[PDB]
Design an enzyme around this catalytic site. Structure first.
Site, PDB file in Angstrom:
ATOM      1  CE  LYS A   1     -10.980  -3.378   1.991  1.00 56.23           C
ATOM      2  NZ  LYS A   1     -10.648  -4.447   2.927  1.00 56.23           N
TER       3      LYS A   1
ATOM      4  CD  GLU B   1      -2.997  -0.878   2.421  1.00 57.79           C
ATOM      5  OE1 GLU B   1      -3.453   0.262   2.667  1.00 57.79           O
ATOM      6  OE2 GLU B   1      -3.320  -1.880   3.104  1.00 57.79           O
TER       7      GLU B   1
HETATM    8 MG   LIG Z   1      -9.096  -3.801   6.604  1.00 57.59          MG
END
Ligand SMILES: [Mg+2]
Ligand SMILES: [Mg+2]
Lengths: 437, 437
Positions: free
Chosen positions: A345, A211
């Protein structure tokens, strides 16, 4: 209007295959790419992988791609769906799969079509994507709200060395006046942090995790947090910058307890913690550090733990693996008073419509919504337009490093610029960005 | 035809600002982003930074942005330029700046306009970008040639720990049948290397450098190269995967000699190497490992070292900092028989036109051309279309990780797909990809 639906394998930011979908209409070609998580929620909709160990180490998506091309495409084109009717698009896709968790076609076959149809729809309507997504979700557009970016700066957990169990340490410039300023000061704390990290842990400690955050051998959350506080201070940004965590506690939950030494191969069950014991860790951290958000403090089905901790937590508590962007599970989490923010998400559920419903349900209950990347991202910028569309006031899309992260942060700068005075920065009000007058 | 030129600050892959430019025509808005190198060649065209220490630690590009919006834009629009005429676009830009190395306006102001004009022109012509770039460079299009990707997998050099002095170690799947196969087998070698690296050097050694390669504390080039060979064998692609190096030797050139222990503050001066001594090291590597390309083996102005080695190499030698994508330096390099391939970096010279001329002068001399990213990249995919349009057969655009690299690699997949039988993979003929029948 849709004349062609086509899928291909492309690469995500970790170099693993994922599905890219292109929809052709009279208005041109519209492309969306499906992201991918690691150690994903056990209740997430199916991410279909080929499992041919001889290619891509079993991670190919040839099968999902075939499902788009040989199953979804010829049915989708002949159905003469109006792409502006996102609900119709997604109802059709869901009806074609026919299973609770999209296990017949794969969520990674369905999602690309769902998302590409929305871009095609925005083109048809001659509006920017964020305007269409607000239309779809019935969100107010005067003013729009630009999100506080929750910027990953350091990672611990399962894919980093050292004993640190918690996964994501984030900075959130809640004190900034514009999104442009937020991104700048966040980049400055990030660079300050890389510098301090190299000086203390060695030149290699500057290398980045998935990330984009630094991921050196760190032992405790307090070590990580002192380090981040040091960077914030060095950069001169105390009091504009707050902290968020993602505990990813499902990754250290076993047999009903929490093993913080889950990396340590000989962990002693005597010090595997109960929920209350772990809650006491978080309490100590809260007292010491400027933490304004905690995500997945307890495991994906450990309801009693979430509900007990939430009564007194007194800060934003975000559900990720608990809820998996799934209206069914969100309903439970609301009823049980387990959390007060959804981590949204889209690929956990597999369609735009269900994701929008997820967000509407969370806002209705007075919850906040943090729109979120996956650890395996792509050059696709959908979630930037989404977070603005849904007016949530908070996004988590990675460190200010690696362009599968900057791609979204850059799209937000463009959206900010385009809107001028018809947008506000969420700032201190990130939790209820949707309710800003 | 062009009604607007507009610039903004966006973030590159390292979280440093750079210049993005949009040109608006009757056919839409066309966007280009300028990449950014580290420890830039002394001869490179000026990258203008603001130097305000209170903002982005002095790395702001507000002056360059202003240059586009306040200086270039009004003049460019009023000039009524035909964007199809790239030479005209670029002659306008360089004659507005009026300095040899673009020091008035900045190369990071000029280049964005240059590249965006080419995208605009492809749209006017109703052709893919790669076709327009082929037209611009008078390259043949029957068939087009897809490049071998030189994929970063491992780095040493100034920003890695340990003693390893050479910068980039790349793998090149020259034995692959298609670009797609190249990218798969390359991804596999990369992951095998990442796993072997975490096993040998620790979980943190799996974290990635700027270009997406692993960067463990490695002590020798042999250690690095043995690891890569292990990974190639483990992934089952023996024979089909070759190696390239970027020595970045300018970074260890001091007092007329080469310090391979340059990261040691008390490096022993008496062990610093002359050109011929260093060449003997390169000869050893060349014979022991499947190395088919070495970039910048000697320093940027150490002309005699290059000429003496080149005769002896027997493999592609690539000039990066020696030539800085500049036709004047390239002419010298050809005259001195210093190398036989150009590393083409559009932002080293600052316009597309100069970049095409650099490539053309190279092919004319029987050189190859390897189109290249910068270490600071963006979501921009221009160089994928450039390498196909220039028919070069080789590109260096990062590891198969971090989407500022995958963006380009994914774009190549799309191009390969779209071209079908009218494209060939350069494969073993990568050096002279432009001369394929
Ligand atoms: Mg998470
Ligand atoms: Mg180089």
């Amino acid at each position: 209007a849709v004349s062609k639906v086509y899928a291909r394998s492309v690469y995500d930011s970790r170099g693993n295959p994922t599905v890219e979908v292109e929809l052709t209409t009279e208005k041109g070609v519209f492309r969306s790419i499906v992201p991918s998580g690691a150690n994903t929620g056990v209740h997430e909709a199916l991410e279909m992988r080929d499992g041919d160990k001889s290619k891509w180490m079993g991670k190919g998506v040839l099968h999902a791609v075939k499902n788009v091309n040989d199953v979804i495409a010829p049915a989708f084109v002949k159905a003469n769906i109006d792409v502006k009717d996102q609900k119709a698009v997604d109802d059709f896709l869901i009806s074609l799969d026919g299973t609770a968790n999209k296990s017949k076609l794969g969520a990674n076959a369905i999602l690309g079509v769902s998302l590409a149809a929305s871009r095609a729809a925005a083109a048809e309507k001659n509006v920017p994507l964020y305007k269409h997504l607000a239309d779809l979700s019935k969100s107010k557009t005067s003013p729009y709200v630009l999100p506080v970016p929750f910027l990953n700066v350091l990672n611990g957990g399962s894919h980093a060395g050292g004993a640190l169990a918690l996964k994501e340490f984030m900075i959130a410039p809640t004190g900034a006046k514009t999104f442009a300023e937020a991104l700048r000061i966040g980049s400055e704390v990030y660079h300050n942090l890389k510098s301090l990290t190299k000086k203390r842990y060695g030149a290699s400690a500057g290398n980045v995790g998935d990330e984009g955050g630094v991921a050196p051998n760190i032992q405790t959350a307090e070590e990580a947090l002192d380090l981040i506080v040091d960077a914030i201070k060095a950069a001169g940004h105390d009091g504009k910058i707050k902290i968020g965590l993602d505990c990813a506690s499902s990754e250290f939950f076993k047999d009903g307890k929490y093993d913080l030494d889950f990396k340590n191969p000989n962990s002693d069950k005597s010090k595997w913690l109960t929920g209350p014991q772990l809650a006491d860790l978080y309490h100590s951290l809260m007292k010491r550090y400027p933490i304004v958000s905690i995500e997945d403090p307890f495991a994906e089905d450990d309801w009693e733990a979430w509900s007990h901790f939430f009564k007194t937590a007194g800060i934003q508590i975000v559900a990720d693996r608990l809820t998996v962007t799934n209206p069914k599970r969100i309903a439970t989490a609301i009823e049980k008073k387990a959390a007060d923010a959804l981590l949204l998400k889209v690929n956990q559920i597999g369609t735009l419509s269900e994701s929008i419903k997820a967000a509407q349900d969370s806002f209705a209950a007075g919850w906040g919504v943090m729109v979120s990347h996956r650890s395996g991202e792509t050059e696709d910028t959908f979630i930037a337009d989404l977070v603005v569309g849904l007016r949530t006031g908070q996004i988590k899309t990675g460190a200010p490093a690696r362009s599968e992260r900057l791609a979204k942060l850059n799209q937000l700068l463009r959206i900010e610029e385009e809107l001028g005075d018809n947008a506000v920065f969420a700032g201190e009000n990130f939790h209820h960005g949707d309710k800003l007058l």
